[PDB]
Symmetry: C4
Subunit: 25 residues, 4 copies
């Protein structure tokens, strides 16, 4: 388990990469 | 909970994205 | 130890930087 | 505490931002 602020940051970062990929595609 | 260095890195990363968004807006 | 979603995000981020470096090289 | 792979990724990410800032400055 992780600090909630770390889990969030991890969610934010994954979604960021997903969005970037979909925008480039 | 997380290593303090991970919590910080998570803070740094969130603030980085926030600043980037506000700069682009 | 970390939340599995954090470990993944960490893997994703490391691989992302690796790929970016190899693409620029 | 965190998974060692997460602590590393956090180190990698902080150093990455540091280097980027110093390169832009
Ligand atoms: C492109 C659309 C805009 C995206 C904006 C992205 C910025 C999002 C802002 C960050 C939200 C982070 C939420 C963070 C939620 C943490 C919850 C907390 O209460 O626990 C604190 C712990 O440390 C105590 O153990
Ligand atoms: C755009 C403005 C400039 C932004 C610069 C961003 C770079 C910031 C530098 C990084 C600060 C990280 C602070 C890290 C704080 C960690 C605290 C520590 O004592 O615990 C170590 C643990 O691992 C032991 O369990
Ligand atoms: C360039 C090629 C495309 C790369 C796409 C990158 C996006 C990858 C998507 C993200 C996958 C994340 C997998 C996440 C796996 C988490 C496993 C889970 O079951 O546990 C949840 C815990 O929180 C419960 O404690
Ligand atoms: C610009 C110069 C080049 C920079 C390249 C950056 C890429 C660095 C590669 C990644 C190194 C990650 C090291 C990862 C070290 C993890 C240690 C491990 O043994 O534990 C595994 C745990 O999950 C078990 O609990
Ligand atoms: C160009 C913009 C790209 C932005 C991509 C990122 C967008 C992310 C948007 C918002 C997602 C917020 C998700 C925030 C999810 C927070 C999860 C949490 O805090 O954990 C709760 C704890 O009690 C359990 O660990
Ligand atoms: C283009 C530049 C963009 C830079 C965006 C990032 C700027 C971040 C600035 C500095 C914020 C430093 C915050 C550092 C916060 C450290 C928190 C910590 O180490 O935890 C203490 C432990 O005892 C509890 O877990
Ligand atoms: C321009 C695209 C660049 C994309 C770079 C990133 C690509 C990453 C690709 C996919 C890797 C997915 C790895 C996902 C690995 C998930 C590990 C996990 O969830 O932990 C399981 C737990 O039970 C134990 O902690
Ligand atoms: C444009 C390139 C920018 C690259 C910036 C990032 C460069 C990073 C370079 C390498 C640093 C590797 C640091 C790797 C440090 C690993 C720490 C670790 O695995 O923890 C050991 C555990 O037993 C305790 O938690
Ligand atoms: Ca906390
Ligand atoms: Ca430590
Ligand atoms: Ca933990
Ligand atoms: Ca969980
Ligand atoms: Ca492990
Ligand atoms: Cl963690």
């Amino acid at each position: 388990s992780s600090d909630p602020l770390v889990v969030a940051a991890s969610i934010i970062g994954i979604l960021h990469l997903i969005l970037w990929i979909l925008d480039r595609l």
